[PDB]
Design a protein around this ligand. Structure first.
Ligand SMILES: Nc1ncnc2c1ncn2[C@@H]1O[C@H](COP(=O)(O)OP(=O)(O)O)[C@@H](O)[C@H]1O
Ligand SMILES: Nc1ncnc2c1ncn2[C@@H]1O[C@H](COP(=O)(O)OP(=O)(O)O)[C@@H](O)[C@H]1O
Lengths: 171, 608
């Protein structure tokens, strides 16, 4: 799809991966491979010899399975883990400010103006639940619904068309 | 003389050399250029001033000499040609001694005559010369083919090779044998391979047997002629009947009386648009006049001189929109998303006009309402005998990224489809997930379509608000549907019934005041996607920003549709579009006026 000509079909290639290359590819991904085309050990009615009709094949031994990569959370400083919150230098401030609520509210919708009531709520959805330690009574739940209704196109959809691009795993 | 021949290489060599020297471009300088020189030393200049090899001939040159060589090249072409190659390599040294005299050239003759056509052939023309044609069918993958192998050993590294004659190879007890240290060791990789490939061909001139399928033929390939051509073309062939037996059984080695026939490959008969600055003269010369807004609007059609009020908006899609690129912050993907549609009676030439527009737009697609479903437009997933395995596979829309697809007879499509287009028109994306792949491709383009109602005529006292088969506010959700209908007037009929039949009756055109440029008009379309970036200073904002009170008193209405605060998105789109024409890098202020005209031309068709 980075090379989109007209006319012919999507010509298919055979292609191979080695062991440590295995199972870190996946459906739906664009790649940067090696080019180590090979001699591959009816209808080919050419001349025959001996002192045989081959097809084409291919292998490759390098992968950059990009456009499908985020990496979770790991100021180069000390913390619980390596880089999970190494920005203590500022997160200390981001947990002690008194106007942080509003400063957070207006930190994702500068290109938007409307009500200022779901700009303080909808962090709800991305925010945590409970994750507590209990017995085998039942599932205990952490996140919860939200709803929107509105008149025709007060930017009902641009709230969420972007939110998918905002956090990961949530298409 | 060679065994089954009656000729000699040297006589043909000498006579072809003298023929090329006795040459003044005589095939069209004597028979039919300010060149009283051989075209062939001229062509070796052209080959060497380029060092771009691969000559070709035409056998009509060789009428001027003896007709004998034509005959004794028709009869034995597979044996005579390379003498002409060494004649070429003599002419190499005659042109320049220290040249690139190691890269060899083909020879690509053609044109004895059409036999009659491919249906009517005989046995006796079995190793001779033919040239027929038709249409191309397929485009298949290429195949190596051995001519020599690599070998080995363990003591002293007998690292050897030996090649093919055609079908007979040798081996002593060793490779590079001395004293017999071991037996023969075969590998088959570190070797030389040659390209070839099979491509099927039709007969479709009018050289057809009535009520008969075309009897089809087949062609091999060789190295620098492999996928020489893309499919879907009419191409002539130059080659030789080249036969081979068939293998009876396969379980046994007996062979069938039916020798097959097929033709070898000799020759066929068929960033990349960056212009010179000389064309900029004529381009900007067209640009310099306000008449350009009307000239191209007049000059799309051949002669259709009614409702030119609309094509002046279609040029805003031909001039395919603006690019407010989003390399800035990653936000909101507000493309210059343009969509405009036409809808009316079937008598108006919508299907006809748009089949012509197929013969205008580069990325022309043309299916239509009940032409193919949603799945009929996306994910043609199915089995293929080529891999012989199941595959996640193609769509239709996504082939036309940034292009157009002319669409007809819209209101026949299934409800599964037409919630697909909601995804593209309102997100301009696509993401797909089946039991196989999950996909996040890229696709975006501008729509055209030519819907029709469930009747012959739009009913008066029944607005489009309910007539055609769509929701209460998604009807108007397109930019603006430029209403069309038959001219309800007998008066107009005579003008076209006269002018557009005299059109046929004379059978050629005339360059009147609206000067049709043969192709120089087409670059003003071509060049004007790339070097432009419309921008706003102060112009196309302030008028409705002023009049918004009475423009947005739209609260009144019983079951109506009207103005909403999305219009100005489409309006800035149309604005910077019409500012692109005239090539105004900064925004145009006049564009706003005809934009308002465009809108209020059809936004109170329901005052009721
Ligand atoms: N307060 C606001 N801030 C930003 N944009 C707004 C605001 N109010 C209205 N809009 C505009 O309203 C439009 C709503 O379109 P949208 O609701 O996404 O269409 P649809 O209803 O088809 O999804 C947005 O494109 C936006 O430009
Ligand atoms: N103004 C016009 N200019 C040219 N052809 C017209 C015009 N009005 C009607 N026609 C006729 O309409 C026909 C094309 O209609 P078409 O678009 O194929 O109908 P549909 O799209 O409903 O199948 C032509 O044969 C032509 O004779």
């Amino acid at each position: 799809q980075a090379e989109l000509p007209r006319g012919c079909i999507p010509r298919a290639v055979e292609i191979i991966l080695r062991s440590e290359l295995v199972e870190t590819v996946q459906a739906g991904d664009r790649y940067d491979f090696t080019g180590t085309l090979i001699v591959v050990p009816l209808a080919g009615v050419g001349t025959r010899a001996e002192n045989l009709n081959y097809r084409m094949a291919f292998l490759a031994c390098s992968v950059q399975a990009t456009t499908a990569r985020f990496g979770g959370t790991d100021t180069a400083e000390d913390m619980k883990k390596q880089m999970t919150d190494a920005e203590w230098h500022k997160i200390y401030e981001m947990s002690k400010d008194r106007n942080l609520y509003q400063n957070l509210i207006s930190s994702l919708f500068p290109s938007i103006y409307g009500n200022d009531e779901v700009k303080r709520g909808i962090l709800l959805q991305q925010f945590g639940g409970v994750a507590k330690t209990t017995t085998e009574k039942t599932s205990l739940r952490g996140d919860i619904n939200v709803c929107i209704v509105g008149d025709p196109s007060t930017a009902k959809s641009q709230f969420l068309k972007q939110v998918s691009d905002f956090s990961p795993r949530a298409i | 003389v060679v065994w089954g021949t009656n000729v000699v290489v040297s006589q043909c060599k000498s006579k072809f050399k003298s023929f090329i020297m006795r040459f003044i471009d005589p095939s069209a300088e004597q028979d039919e250029i300010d060149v009283n020189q051989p075209l062939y030393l001229q062509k070796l200049e052209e080959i060497h001033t380029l060092e771009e090899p691969y000559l070709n001939l035409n056998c009509a040159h060789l009428k001027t000499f003896d007709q004998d060589l034509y005959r004794q090249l028709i009869c034995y072409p597979q044996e005579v040609i390379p003498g002409f190659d060494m004649a070429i390599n003599e002419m190499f040294f005659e042109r320049y001694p220290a040249a690139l005299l190691e890269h060899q050239i083909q020879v690509r003759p053609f044109n004895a005559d059409k036999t009659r056509n491919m249906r009517s052939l005989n046995p006796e023309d079995m190793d001779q010369l033919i040239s027929i044609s038709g249409m191309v069918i397929r485009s298949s993958n290429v195949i190596p083919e051995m001519r020599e192998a690599f070998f080995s050993c363990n003591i002293c590294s007998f690292s050897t090779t030996v090649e093919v004659d055609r079908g007979r190879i040798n081996q002593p007890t060793l490779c590079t044998n001395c004293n017999t240290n071991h037996c023969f060791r075969l590998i088959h990789n570190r070797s030389e391979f040659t390209d070839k490939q099979l491509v099927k061909l039709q007969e479709s001139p009018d050289d057809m047997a009535a009520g008969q399928t075309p009897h089809n033929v087949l062609l091999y390939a060789h190295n620098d002629l492999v996928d020489k051509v893309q499919p879907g073309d009419r191409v002539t062939v130059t080659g030789i009947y080249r036969a081979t037996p068939l293998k009876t059984g396969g379980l046994s080695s007996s062979v069938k009386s039916v020798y097959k026939t097929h033709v070898d490959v000799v020759h066929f008969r068929k960033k990349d648009h960056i212009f010179p600055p000389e064309r900029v003269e004529l381009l900007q010369l067209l640009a310099k006049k306000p008449d350009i807004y009307d000239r191209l609007a007049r000059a799309i059609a051949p002669s259709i001189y009614e409702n030119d009020d609309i094509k002046k908006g279609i040029l805003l899609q031909l001039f395919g929109g603006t690019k407010k690129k989003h390399a800035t912050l990653g936000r909101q993907n507000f493309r210059s998303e343009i969509h405009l549609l036409l809808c009316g009676d079937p008598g108006t030439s919508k299907s006809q006009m748009l089949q012509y527009v197929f013969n205008l737009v580069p990325r022309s697609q043309y299916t239509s309402g009940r032409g193919s479903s949603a799945v009929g437009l996306t994910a043609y997933v199915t089995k293929d005998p080529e891999t012989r395995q199941l595959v996640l596979q193609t769509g239709a829309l996504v082939l036309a990224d940034n292009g157009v697809c002319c669409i007809d007879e819209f209101d026949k499509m299934n409800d599964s489809t037409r919630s697909v287009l909601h995804e593209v028109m309102e997100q301009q994306t696509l993401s797909i997930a089946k039991a196989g792949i999950i996909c996040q491709l890229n696709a975006r383009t501008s729509i055209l379509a030519a819907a029709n109602p469930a009747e012959s005529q739009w009913n008066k006292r029944k607005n489009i608000i309910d007539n055609v088969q769509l929701p209460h506010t998604l009807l108007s959700r397109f930019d603006l549907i430029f209403l069309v209908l038959d001219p309800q007037d007998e008066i107009f009929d005579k003008r076209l019934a006269s002018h557009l039949v005299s059109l046929y009756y004379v059978t050629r055109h005339e360059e009147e005041d609206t000067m049709f440029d043969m192709s120089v008009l087409r670059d003003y379309i071509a060049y004007a996607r790339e070097h432009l970036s419309p921008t706003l200073s102060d112009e196309a904002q302030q008028r409705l920003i002023q009049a918004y009170v009475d423009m947005r008193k739209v609260g009144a209405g019983r079951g109506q549709i009207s103005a909403y605060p999305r219009q100005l998105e489409s309006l800035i789109r149309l604005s910077e579009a019409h500012a692109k024409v005239r090539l105004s890098n900064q925004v145009e202020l006049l564009d706003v006026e005809e934009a308002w005209r465009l809108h209020r031309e059809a936004l109170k068709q329901s005052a009721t």
